[PDB]
Paper text:
Actinoporins are a family of α-pore-forming toxins (α-PFTs) that have been identified in sea anemones. Recently, a Hydra Actinoporin-Like Toxin ([name]) gene family has been found in Hydra magnipapillata and composed of seven paralogs, in which [name], [name]-4, and [name]-7 are secreted as part of venom by Hydra during its prey hunting. Despite HALTs exhibit haemolytic and cytolytic activities that are similar to actinoporins, HALTs were recently shown to bind to sulfatide (SFT) as the primary target, unlike AfFraC, AeEqt, and ShStn-II that bind predominantly to sphingomyelin. The recombinant [name] was found to exert haemolytic activity, and also capable to cause physical lysis on the majority of human cell lines.
To unveil the structural insights into lipid preference of HALTs protein as compared to sea anemone actinoporins, we have determined the first crystal structure of actinoporin-like toxin, [name] at 1.43 Å resolution with an acetylated lysine residue K76. The crystal belonged to a space group P212121 with one monomer in the asymmetric unit. The overall structure of rHALT-1 resembles an α-pore-forming toxin (α-PFT) with β sandwich fold consisting of 12 beta strands, two alpha helices, and two 310 helices. The rHALT-1 structure revealed the coordination of all the side chains of aromatic residues including Y90, W107, Y110, W113, F125, Y129, W144, and the P104-[W/Y/F]-D106 motif, which are highly conserved to its counterparts in sea anemones. The crystal structure of rHALT-1 has the residue lysine 76 acetylated to form N6-acetyl-l-lysine that interacted with a water molecule through its carbonyl group. In the lipid-binding region, the [name] contains a shorter α2 helix and a longer α2-β9 loop due to deletion and subsequently an insertion of five amino acid residues in comparison to the sea anemone actinoporins. An overlay of [name] with sea anemone actinoporins showed that the shorter β-turn in [name] resulted in the main chain atoms of G142–W144 (equivalent to N147–W149AfFraC) shifted ~ 2 Å towards the β-sandwich core as compared to other sea anemone actinoporins. A comparison between [name] and AfFraC in complex with DHPC revealed that the change of residue Y133AfFraC (a conserved residue among sea anemone actinoporins) to F125HALT-1 (a conserved residue among HALTs) caused the loss of C–H⋯O hydrogen bonds between the side chain oxygen atom of tyrosine and the trimethylammonium methyl group of choline, which was a physical state found in AfFraC-sphingomyelin head group interaction. Structure comparison and molecular docking analysis further revealed that the [name] lipid-binding site may favour sphingolipids with sulfate or phosphate head group more than the sphingomyelin.
Residue numbers in the entry: 3 to 168
The structure:
């Protein structure tokens, strides 16, 4: 499963562990992600909004009771962060997840956010708390928006965990 981007049965912690065997990477800022689908519907992979860098691994649909796994990396050679929004379809709704790992930790902090709405949300609206999104959650803290729980480690080489239940 890990090589396909999606693992059955396991939750976020176990899924994160399986990433290293199937991903290398050579950038100094990244976030590994696990999206645990405890809902009743498949989360269909819908897109990404690249603020800095990209999703560099396979992007899979997540059936109920599976966990999607992937990595977001800064661009090779950039002194920029790993910063992106990942979108899934949930019925006709859109699940938006965001994590932001800076290059310059002297100037910036690390942040995450989640928002289920009718559309793909911009990075800016997820970082500002606009258009219905909440103010973002600082790394190192459990967040919960509309019953979706999430956590981003405060690391250059981070882990972003999302548990979605509908």
């Amino acid at each position: 499963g890990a090589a396909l981007g999606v693992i059955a049965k396991v939750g976020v912690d176990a899924a994160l562990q399986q990433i290293d065997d199937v991903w290398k990477g050579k950038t100094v800022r990244y976030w590994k992600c696990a999206v645990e689908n405890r809902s009743s519907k498949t989360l269909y992979a819908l897109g990404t909004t690249q603020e800095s860098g990209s999703m560099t691994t396979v992007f899979a649909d997540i059936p109920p009771k599976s966990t999607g796994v992937f990595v977001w990396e800064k661009s090779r050679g950039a002194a920029k962060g790993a910063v992106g929004v990942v979108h899934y379809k949930y019925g006709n709704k859109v699940l938006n997840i965001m994590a932001s790992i800076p290059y310059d930790w002297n100037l910036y902090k690390a942040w995450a956010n989640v928002h289920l709405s009718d559309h793909k949300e911009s990075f800016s609206d997820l970082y500002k708390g606009k258009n219905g999104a909440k103010y973002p959650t600082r790394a190192g803290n459990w967040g919960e928006v509309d019953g979706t729980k999430f956590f981003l480690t405060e690391k250059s080489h981070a882990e972003f965990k999302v548990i979605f239940s509908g």
